[PDB]
């Protein structure tokens, strides 16, 4: 995360940390969100270069990447589902969403705690407005030109950007479609970055934190006129219900 502050999972207790196994400790690879006790949502691009469920391990309840955290829970991936129309197109990703069924060494799904909670999915519809300020979180880089990653969780606040604005040529032109969500900082100083992908974009809808987007792409980090782009979760609700329901 560029900008924002360092924080503890207790402030993003749906955050899921997805690592890849090694031939020998596992490598942090990207973020995700606990959308139900057995199911983590993330980005499909996180799994392409090796799409085998046995190669991944999911930790819930972590403030510090790649070390033990009190109240941590470690899960194997029972089932790995990538969207059927996932696709890379030279600038960006499309239909960039994945579902992971998680399970412990002893069979259990996620056990709630102050550091492990689920996050709500957006409603089909809702009347009554809400704010366009939404939260991001992850272990991504703190600046686009860093080598090296922070090792401790960070969080920040960005504003949603209208499709129309995001589609202006100065922004991302016709690469942006109705299945995507754009979010940036109005003064271009806080953003998600490399290593934040798959992680959540938390808006506050009908009074509760809501998973409105998944970190998918953007040119650099906190660059002027280059918002972060998120899978628009509300668009995939029926797809999500048909798999986890």
């Amino acid at each position: 995360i560029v900008g924002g502050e360092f924080t503890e999972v207790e402030n993003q207790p749906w955050f899921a940390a997805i690592y890849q196994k090694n031939k020998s400790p596992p490598s942090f690879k990207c973020g995700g969100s606990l959308i139900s006790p057995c199911w983590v949502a993330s980005a499909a691009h996180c799994f392409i270069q090796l799409p085998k469920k046995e190669n991944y391990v999911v930790y819930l309840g972590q403030s510090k990447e790649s070390s033990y955290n009190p109240g941590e829970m470690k899960f194997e991936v029972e089932q790995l589902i990538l969207h059927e129309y996932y696709r890379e197109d030279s600038l960006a990703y499309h239909n960039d969403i994945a579902l992971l069924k998680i399970r412990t060494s002893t069979g259990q799904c996620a056990q709630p705690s102050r550091s492990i909670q689920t996050i709500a999915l957006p409603p089909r519809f809702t009347d009554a407005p809400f704010g366009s300020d939404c939260e991001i979180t992850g272990f991504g880089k703190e600046s686009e030109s860093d080598y090296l990653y922070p090792k401790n969780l960070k969080m920040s606040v960005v504003k949603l950007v209208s499709h129309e604005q995001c589609m202006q040529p100065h922004y991302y032109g016709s690469e942006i479609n109705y299945k995507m969500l754009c979010a940036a900082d109005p003064e271009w100083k806080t953003d998600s970055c490399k290593g934040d992908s798959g992680g959540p974009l938390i808006c506050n809808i009908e009074g509760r934190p809501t998973l409105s987007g998944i970190v998918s792409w953007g040119r650099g980090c906190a660059e002027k006129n280059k918002p972060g782009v998120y899978t628009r979760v509300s668009h995939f609700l029926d797809w999500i219900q048909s798999h986890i329901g």
Binding site: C30, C46, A92, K194, G195, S197, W217, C221
Partner: peptide, 10 residues
């Protein structure tokens, strides 16, 4: 990897 990726593996 598409150019505007924010993936650690790109």
């Amino acid at each position: 990897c598409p150019a505007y990726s924010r993936y650690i593996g790109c």
